[PDB]
């Protein structure tokens, strides 16, 4: 009758295709849909929520709650307190809401948002330099080379100055989630602007850090997250 043709890719079965299918159980009446609080229509809105970065992950501290905070004390000369190499495949970011939404997608774009929170007493005071070195730069090794990039001065007694927004600085339009020398995104490092001055000598600070996506974050090419592995069948 009608001259149809079946091209290549007709009798194919593609996992990712979109096709209508016959309904077994016809006339079945689905139970009514009430109003449940918290509907989420998109999985990027999970990446938008702050989540603590395991900034202390070392031999002893991994697997414990102490893996989330860094100890700062008063020191005579500036030191480099912390370095957060910017990759969504790295344990620092990969284990957060941001990084573990982005490890389903093969590359991304937009700005990271990194907030710091110091847990100390009310009498302590400090000035910290938070510096993002763009792609292509070395990790600074001293504060005079860290200050020449993007940086903010995080001052205690404000907590409006905590958040640094890692800008999007890239050649290409997207950055690969898996760290590689071509697209590598740079380094966020933490320094002592002045000092952490406790109310009494020998005092101790404790620093936490969070990461979330900025509204211009975007991702593409959904894939298998490295963040799950099944080595034996579930029974």
């Amino acid at each position: 009758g009608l001259p149809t043709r079946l091209p290549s890719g007709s009798q194919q079965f593609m996992t990712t295709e979109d096709e209508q299918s016959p309904n077994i159980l016809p006339g079945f009446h689905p139970s009514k849909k009430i109003h449940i609080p918290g509907m989420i229509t998109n999985v990027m809105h999970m990446a938008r929520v702050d989540s603590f970065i395991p900034i202390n992950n070392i031999q002893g501290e991994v697997g414990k709650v102490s893996m989330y905070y860094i100890t700062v004390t008063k020191k005579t000369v500036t030191e480099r307190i912390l370095v957060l190499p910017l990759e969504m495949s790295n344990t620092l970011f990969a284990t957060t809401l941001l990084g573990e939404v982005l490890n389903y997608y093969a590359n991304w774009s937009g700005s990271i948002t990194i907030t710091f929170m110091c847990v100390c007493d009310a009498f302590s005071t400090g000035k910290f330099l938070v510096a993002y070195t763009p792609p292509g730069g070395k990790l600074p090794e001293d504060r005079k080379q860290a200050m020449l990039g993007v940086h903010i001065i995080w001052d205690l007694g404000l907590q409006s100055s905590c958040t640094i927004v890692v800008p999007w600085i890239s050649s290409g339009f997207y950055r690969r989630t898996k760290a590689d020398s071509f697209t590598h995104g740079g380094y966020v490092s933490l320094w002592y602007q002045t000092a952490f001055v406790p109310p009494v000598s020998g005092g101790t600070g404790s620093i936490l850090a969070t990461c979330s996506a900025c509204p211009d974050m975007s991702v593409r090419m959904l894939r298998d997250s490295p963040m799950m592995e099944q080595k034996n069948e579930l029974q």
């Binding site: 979109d18 016959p22 918290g38 938008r48 702050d50 989540s51 957060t96 929170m117 847990v119 101790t204």
Partner: protein, 303 residues
């Protein structure tokens, strides 16, 4: 066939004549075209919708603190109304007698204290005429207001995470396949002190997981911020308030069997005394049932 009642049009067609036989769901438009954030998540400020509903007083008990209240999922608690309800039977509203602030046993917060959790409504089962209406009714729904209050001095230090997890399903303390016991996940008002992790923790009778880092369910802390939460930092604030609506698939559930919330309090950073000599501080929790409804009255389900 059927249909139904850089920009690409398409003729909407069900080839098989039915819904649910249809393909995947996109976003339609009637005419040509020519979103980034969800404020419901991120735990709004209860002023971020409206403050007219709130100095906080429910049902004969007063809280004086309310811009820093977090409104869970940006939804204010409300009665089941209709059209979302299964039974036509008129629920009971106890209002100010069973909707009031119930303060629980305080818990010492020490160095080395791993955390605490309370299941809800369960914590309130013996509390007042709310805890009476649980047993005498088949079903029920309630929204809650959790006020967590821990006060130390300017010399002290350390932070807590106060989170409310919908459907927090505990992991068994280890090894083989066992359901955690009904009794260990229904502790009462005393809640459960997290004493682990250790390889020596007792495994019997389905005891729950004692590891605070994995949230006892196997998911990290620091991702616990996806739930409604507040962080109490003794450098900044001494207290917390969280307003949760009724979260569940069902309009009303049993309240004895099903605990649809969990109040988890984790010492994110330990408690360090300053020059002061105080090594431990009480944490107090005050729960208010709010917009609670009960239906299916019977003999007290009490044993």
């Amino acid at each position: 066939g059927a249909q139904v009642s850089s920009v690409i049009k398409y003729f909407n067609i069900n080839y098989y004549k039915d819904s649910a036989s249809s393909g995947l769901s996109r976003q339609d438009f009637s005419q040509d075209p020519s979103t980034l954030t969800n404020p419901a998540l991120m735990s709004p400020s209860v002023e971020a919708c409206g403050y007219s509903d709130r100095q906080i007083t429910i049902g004969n008990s007063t809280i004086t603190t309310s811009l820093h209240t977090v409104l869970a999922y940006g939804e204010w608690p409300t009665y089941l109304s209709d059209i979302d309800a299964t039974s036509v039977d008129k629920p009971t509203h106890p209002e100010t007698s069973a909707d009031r602030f119930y303060t629980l046993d305080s818990v010492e917060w020490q160095v080395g204290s791993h955390g605490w959790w309370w299941k809800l409504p369960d914590a309130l089962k013996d509390m007042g005429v709310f805890g009476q209406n649980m047993y005498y009714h088949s079903m029920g729904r309630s929204g809650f207001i959790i006020h967590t209050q821990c006060n130390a001095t300017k010399f002290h230090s350390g932070a807590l995470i106060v989170a409310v997890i919908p459907e927090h399903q505990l992991a068994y303390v280890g090894g083989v396949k066992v359901n955690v016991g009904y009794d260990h996940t229904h502790p009462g008002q005393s809640g459960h002190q997290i004493r682990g992790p250790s390889q020596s923790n007792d495994r019997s009778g389905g005891k729950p997981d004692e590891d605070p880092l994995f949230n006892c369910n196997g998911t990290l802390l620091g991702n616990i911020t996806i739930f409604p939460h507040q962080i109490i930092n003794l450098r900044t604030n001494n207290s917390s308030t969280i307003v949760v609506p009724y979260i569940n698939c069902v309009p009303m559930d049993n309240m004895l069997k099903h605990n649809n919330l969990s109040l988890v309090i984790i010492p994110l950073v330990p408690l360090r005394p300053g020059s002061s000599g105080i090594n431990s501080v009480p944490i107090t929790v005050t729960i208010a049932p709010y917009k609670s409804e009960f239906s299916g009255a019977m003999e007290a389900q009490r044993q």
